[PDB]
């Protein structure tokens, strides 16, 4: 597709460890394992990947030796770059990873050269642990406590895709002694809502399941819409998985409020005015349908004029969102920049 | 299961440094619970509210911590104690921590000793306290430290245990626990 | 003083001067309670003040009272208050409360001065119900040698619009009274809409007397400006979404007869507060700054 030809396309069946030496190499083995797991797709999620990367970085910082004359302050910064270039080669990064990169580089630079190696190592490990503890778990607990006040008996809540924060909030609210039922909507390049369906069924909550194109059929019954997010842009738009904007638009057409939950450490500084351009493409071979004998799109490379498109991200304007919940409270969507980054 | 005051006193005096664990945060002050004088409520007024600072915090990071605070005003009839934090010196905090640890160890070993006797309530625990440890610190005329050093010295000389009005049933368990913990 | 004395003082203060709002009466009663409290403790004083505020809110169900009490409590405690003596702290908070009371009584004139310049020459103004701040605004405007015409609504079920018109008569301005169901018919001739307020919410909307939502929708359907006059001590922490989410203790006063309704921020143009002139997006963080 010439429209999205600017973005690169990568396949998930290209082994990168074939030409690497077996008993360790320039790349630390922990990064090799992490990149292998990322490429195989065994670790998915906007928040688990950051934790795994930080754990690997802790492991590398544990095993380090200062050069005989060179100070570690610049040596570590120079050493870290090839590893994360390799990680980017394995799979494109996300906003949380970039923020963690910036914080870690700031911490590494800020250290003084008077201290010994062991003191610096201990301080860096303690700082990383403090960051992980403070910026993920406590924020989730505070967000759940804040959002508990907008759920009442007899409500019907609509969720899309899979998100850990939404499941945690719903399970805590149900345990607190509230009664309601949930509706799950799924798309069909991944089918990621089945995880949420299983978790909710196990928790003991009634639920319904359906596909995205029928969204207009069930919206007359719904009363609230709850959504997660991947990043927050400077102008106030919300970036998420493909299809969220459709749900927002149809809910607006049926007069249904929409709520968005996100953590404060995913705040970016980019500006975007359309749901295009800066996105990520995926493997086009997954769109092949397996319906009995009829298997179209097989060997689609034979036809010259046939193209398959696979987007991953979608930007939603702030005119279709009515409330945003963060660890600092609840605010209107248009007021995101005036509080999130005004502390600078 | 059991709970008893660390000292025979019921209320602290002025210019006293005490352990404190933050319980909840209100709009003007901090609701806290004391430990040495059992679970009793108290307020710490936030100087300047730390007002700009408090806007950007999760507001629940401070729940469940420990520090030393100084008592300024006391009202026995209602049960209200005024506390402060700025009026604290680190040298005093060192003795605060040391005394808290010593009292904690003494309380733990005494409670373990009384556990074997299986006190139904804490009234018998209070009687044991006033018959063994409170009388100890009264005889030594010093609070907290006297009982601790007496127990630490008795690990080699149990004869002093016979000086007090201690029954053999209590004495056996107490000697066993003292030689177990203190060693 | 006890609960009966509290209620007696509250009702007497309300009755003495009809030209006075509930918030000022609650603040004065709280100050009186502060000046007659005995004991040696801070938490005891806080508990007594909280109980007094609760028993005051119990008698009268209006939004402004609770916000005024909370703001009073927060404001009087924003100083050192460490010292060693109860009396010095008591005098300090008494002085702070007196200064706060002095500050409150200087907002209507500022609102009128800021808002009177938005009225054109020879214009038709539609308003709803009775509100003293709008009357002050119009008096200031007419003192500046301008001419205009005014429409009002009967405002069922207590017919306060007739009282508003009678008050407007002394200012020799042309005034008309229309039915409560003729708003859509009369919207064509109007030029701008000015209404009062009873409480400002987080997202920017307002809470007012029943019958404002339809006026706002009708004005939006024909592209007419919508203006709101409010006060600083009426900002409350609440994030309603629809008409159901309003708390029940404000809906029904002490067949359905609700007394108040909420209007969204997307149907409003400007807000004229004592802080200045704010777009609806500015309230979302001005409220955060205010509740220090």
UniProtKB/Swiss-Prot annotation, chain A:
Subcellular location(s) of the protein: Cytoplasm, Cytosol
Main location per the UniProt record: cytoplasm
Alphabetical GO biological process terms: cytoplasmic translational initiation; myelination; oligodendrocyte development; ovarian follicle development; regulation of translation; response to glucose; response to heat; response to peptide hormone
GO CC terms: cytoplasm; cytosol; eukaryotic translation initiation factor 2B complex
Keywords: Acetylation, Cytoplasm, Disease variant, Initiation factor, Leukodystrophy, Phosphoprotein, Protein biosynthesis
Domain of life, per lineage: Eukaryota
Regulation: Activated by the chemical integrated stress response (ISR) inhibitor ISRIB which stimulates guanine nucleotide exchange factor activity for both phosphorylated and unphosphorylated eIF2.
Any one GO MF annotation of this record: translation initiation factor activity
Disease: Leukoencephalopathy with vanishing white matter 4: An autosomal recessive brain disease characterized by neurological features including progressive cerebellar ataxia, spasticity, and cognitive deficits. Brain imaging shows abnormal white matter that vanishes over time and is replaced by cerebrospinal fluid. Disease severity ranges from fatal infantile forms to adult forms without neurological deterioration. The disease is progressive with, in most individuals, additional episodes of rapid deterioration following febrile infections or minor head trauma.
Quaternary structure annotation from Swiss-Prot or TrEMBL: Component of the translation initiation factor 2B (eIF2B) complex which is a heterodecamer of two sets of five different subunits: alpha, beta, gamma, delta and epsilon. Subunits alpha, beta and delta comprise a regulatory subcomplex and subunits epsilon and gamma comprise a catalytic subcomplex. Within the complex, the hexameric regulatory complex resides at the center, with the two heterodimeric catalytic subcomplexes bound on opposite sides.
Gene label: EIF2B4
Swiss-Prot record, chain B:
Modified-residue entries (Phosphoserine), positions: 47, 50, 156
One GO CC term on file: eukaryotic translation initiation factor 2 complex
Positions of the S1 motif domain: 15-86
Superkingdom: Eukaryota
Transmembrane segments: none
Primary subcellular site in the record, as a coarse category: cytoplasm
PTM entry text: Phosphorylation at Ser-47 and Ser-50 stabilizes the eIF-2/GDP/eIF2B complex and prevents GDP/GTP exchange reaction, thus impairing the recycling of eIF-2 between successive rounds of initiation and leading to global inhibition of translation, while concomitantly initiating the preferential translation of integrated stress response (ISR)-specific mRNAs. Substrate for at least 4 kinases: EIF2AK1/HRI, EIF2AK2/PKR, EIF2AK3/PERK and EIF2AK4/GCN2. Phosphorylation on Ser-50 by the EIF2AK4/GCN2 protein kinase occurs in response to amino acid starvation and UV irradiation.
Molecular function GO labels: ribosome binding; RNA binding; translation initiation factor activity
Reported induction: Up-regulated upon endoplasmic reticulum stress.
Regulation of its activity: Activity is regulated by phosphorylation at Ser-47 and Ser-50, which stabilizes the eIF2/GDP/eIF2B complex and prevents the eIF2B-mediated exchange of GDP for GTP, thereby preventing the formation of the 43S pre-initiation complex (43S PIC). This results in the global attenuation of 5' cap-dependent protein synthesis and concomitant translation of ISR-specific mRNAs that contain a short upstream open reading frame (uORF) in their 5' UTR, such as ATF4, ATF5, DDIT3/CHOP and PPP1R15A/GADD34.
This protein's UniProt keywords: Acetylation, Cytoplasm, Initiation factor, Mitochondrion, Phosphoprotein, Protein biosynthesis, RNA-binding, Translation regulation
Annotated family: Belongs to the eIF-2-alpha family.
UniProt-recorded name of the protein: Eukaryotic translation initiation factor 2 subunit 1
Gene: EIF2S1
Span within the parent record: 3 to 185 of 315
Curated annotation (Swiss-Prot), chain C:
GO cellular component: cytoplasm; cytosol; eukaryotic translation initiation factor 2B complex; membrane; plasma membrane
Keywords, in A-Z order: Acetylation, Cytoplasm, Disease variant, Initiation factor, Leukodystrophy, Protein biosynthesis
Modified residues (N6-acetyllysine): 35
Subcellular location as annotated: Cytoplasm, Cytosol
Activity regulation note: Activated by the chemical integrated stress response (ISR) inhibitor ISRIB which stimulates guanine nucleotide exchange factor activity for both phosphorylated and unphosphorylated eIF2.
UniProt GO MF annotations: guanyl-nucleotide exchange factor activity; identical protein binding; translation initiation factor activity
InterPro entries noted in UniProt: eIF2B_alpha/beta/delta (IPR051501), elF-2B_alpha_N (IPR042528), IF-2B-related (IPR000649), IF_2B-like_C (IPR042529), NagB/RpiA_transferase-like (IPR037171)
BP GO annotations: cytoplasmic translational initiation; oligodendrocyte development; response to glucose; response to heat; response to peptide hormone; T cell receptor signaling pathway; translational initiation
Principal localisation: cytoplasm
Keyword Zinc-finger: no
Family statement: Belongs to the eIF-2B alpha/beta/delta subunits family.
Subunit details: Component of the translation initiation factor 2B (eIF2B) complex which is a heterodecamer of two sets of five different subunits: alpha, beta, gamma, delta and epsilon. Subunits alpha, beta and delta comprise a regulatory subcomplex and subunits epsilon and gamma comprise a catalytic subcomplex. Within the complex, the hexameric regulatory complex resides at the center, with the two heterodimeric catalytic subcomplexes bound on opposite sides.
Record-linked PANTHER family: TRANSLATION INITIATION FACTOR EIF-2B SUBUNIT ALPHA
The name this protein goes by in its record: Translation initiation factor eIF2B subunit alpha
Species of origin: Homo sapiens
Gene: EIF2B1
